[PDB]
Symmetry: C4
Subunit: 257 residues, 4 copies
């Protein structure tokens, strides 16, 4: 069904990495390269239009809601709303972020999914750098930056960013009840990825704060057909049924927190 | 004594997979291929006649009663009632189905046995498919389907089914006291195995519900000598003695439940 | 200091395996082969004379007293009483015999020692056979038989037995306070090792019960210099000091029992 | 940033190993070889002058304060006070010295660091020798000796010692509150490393007790520029902030003690 391993050919090393910020709807489609893969994260399906098309090379989800996101992704595929080749769980392999049970049982529950830390741990210098900042200074990169690192470790050489700026009703039912991230840390981490691994990073949204830090991609007069989402499109994270498997999973997660 | 690894030669890729349903006694022996291996499961020895002969390529048992079935199989071999080349424990490697202790101590207790999940986990697409259904929808395939997947992952290309329809006195003493399986899920899973791995699946029992879903094998006028079971044949699952090893095993199993 | 791996050359496949029974002093030295390695077990050093010389290829100790035996062996070497090339811990890798902590921490405490089960587990048929008998029937082979299996798995083809028949003051201080073994099981297991792995097994003591089951080796008029043990020879298992390491080890052992 | 693996070329096998004893300031710089790498340990940065320069091939820290030392080393590098190519945690892989959690989570917290025991465990004879002495006699080698073993296992053939003789205010705040090491054990262990692995060991300090046991290196009229440390040099072990990662780490360490 989906990819065993995500292999990047030296003939196509372009990747579009998108967050879910406002600028996602303000993409300058003329600046996109003619060839590219797309990385989406978290609640990307909440989008009312296919701002980056229906074919996603990889999606990224946080461990806290992986159970529901994994299920939501399967359904997005089954309902033909998106084509998803890979599903990653954005991880750092740190015991105070991901419990041992979670990491150790990950593949038992999600055999075709992938733990992100096994990919970024290869960026030895960058990896040691984010763990040092996390552990001793409480600084953590956001999903967009995490995806950039993943793209770099995988072999992409040119990155185009959008949606990086600086509904949850089902989330409210999932989590009954109501400072490590920062614009500066994100930028610094992005600049480090650039200088260490020699890759290019462009912005795609003309009026984004992001554009003040990275050069907007060249307007090569590219075109794009913006397709609107269907009426009954999944627009919120899916809830899970209390089956024996789900109750076992949730019971164990709750304990570890 | 028995096989280290079950290897299928490209010269003989026929496998007969049998459940213990009524249709087991209504096999149309003329439809069997001239060459084939046989897979049996659970309480197959309860059979009053050798409906499929004495030579079994592999037997399959559920973890819940593996201790007693393993012992029962050894005795079936020792008493010359059957020839058994492999013994599998039908597993999925899911913590809410098989405890960690069970899986982790499996080979320590049964060195010449085999964990089924290590075989079917290679059918990547099918594997992800049954885990998704199990975990999120409480749907589980039955032993016959499990055996089909095992046969496919091992290299068999043509499957012939029987005994798939849709005493326990020693079982009652083993378990003092008295919804995930379904005809539809089984069929769907079988059809998926067929379309993904390109194999053929035939029925062998003319008057079975199974025949309404899979094509009866061609009557090639094959013959079969139906041998009756001897008087003192083991016809019920064997009970174990409360040795230090068995009491340790049972004590730990009981805890995990 | 001692051997990393015990390798048997096809030029010398003779091994002398000795228990500590009475017949140890009644060895017919004329029957020994001209070339051979020696395996000793448990309290072999209690011997008042070097009934089999000072050079031992491997010694075997039970887990229950391994801590003290390991220490005792080191001292036997340091004091020049014996030359010991390998030290094995006779194990089966069964949780009701060896705790998980013991097995898992084994090499951390005894880096140059060796777990026997990692050697005999290669005798697949024999291994499955002893585990079946142990677990379901409470039958266990004795050290002499264990050593035979180890010798066979290592490559020796001809076995010569002695000391197999069918002080502890420091043992009494080690264990303050006061049915799985049998002559028949031992013989049967020895006969099985013979028929499965095609090796020869001879007896060396003319007046031993063992000689009624295995053929005495041919009197090839071999000679032997029986050296008496020195006055201050270690003749009892050594006691350990309550260092932080020993107290930690003993505290954990006690718990697991 | 720093080395993945510390490789010693056969063209440069000289290593300078220094403790923090008084003799560190009494080094006879004329005796140093023209080519060499340097190993420093523990509170080496407390030094008021660069007695061995600014380029350290590897630093060694004890597990008890690794969290703070790791952080201190990163800062020494960032502040340009020292160049550090490798960071080792001096370990023996013994459960009564290093908790299982510590060892098992080590790389998760310090991805670019290195566990020393994985290096010295290759000196099979020496390794078995120190574990035997530690466990049964409560004798442990000091950091200088530990570094010598590490250097030898890595490929250095000639060792030059200094600082081996026989502030903590931040240490007092780290550890609120106030017999296995010995001059004789250290010397004996050093002599053993010499006779087993055929390497040379020289002293560099003319008036050190160490010089009475190892030959002072030849005065080859070598020269050395003694650079004083800057005013604001880090001269005490750095304290860590109570971030979620640090509090998790410390909470777990405290438990295991």
């Amino acid at each position: 069904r989906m990819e065993n391993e995500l292999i990047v050919s030296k003939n196509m090393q372009n990747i579009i990495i998108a967050g879910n910020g406002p600028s996602l709807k303000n993409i300058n489609y003329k600046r996109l390269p003619r060839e590219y893969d797309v990385f989406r994260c978290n609640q990307f399906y909440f989008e009312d239009k296919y701002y980056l098309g229906k074919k996603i090379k990889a999606v990224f989800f946080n461990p806290g809601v992986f159970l529901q996101q994994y299920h939501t992704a399967k359904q997005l595929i089954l309902k033909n709303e998106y084509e998803i080749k890979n599903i990653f769980c954005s991880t750092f392999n740190l015991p105070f972020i991901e419990s041992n049970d979670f990491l150790h049982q990950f593949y038992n529950f999600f055999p075709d999914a992938k733990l992100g830390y096994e990919v970024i741990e290869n960026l030895k210098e960058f990896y040691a750098y984010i763990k040092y900042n996390e552990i001793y200074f409480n600084k953590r990169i956001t999903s967009g930056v995490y995806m950039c690192a993943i793209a770099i470790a995988l072999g992409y050489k040119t990155i185009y960013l959008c949606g990086i700026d600086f509904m949850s009703t089902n989330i409210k039912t999932i989590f009954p009840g109501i400072n490590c991230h920062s614009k500066e840390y994100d930028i610094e981490a992005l600049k480090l990825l650039k200088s260490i691994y020699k890759v290019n990073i462009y912005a795609l949204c003309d009026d984004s704060i992001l554009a003040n830090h990275f050069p907007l991609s060249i307007n090569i007069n590219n075109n794009f057909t913006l397709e609107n989402k269907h009426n009954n499109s999944i627009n919120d994270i899916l809830l899970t049924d209390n089956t024996p498997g789900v109750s076992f999973y949730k019971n164990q997660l709750k304990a570890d927190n």
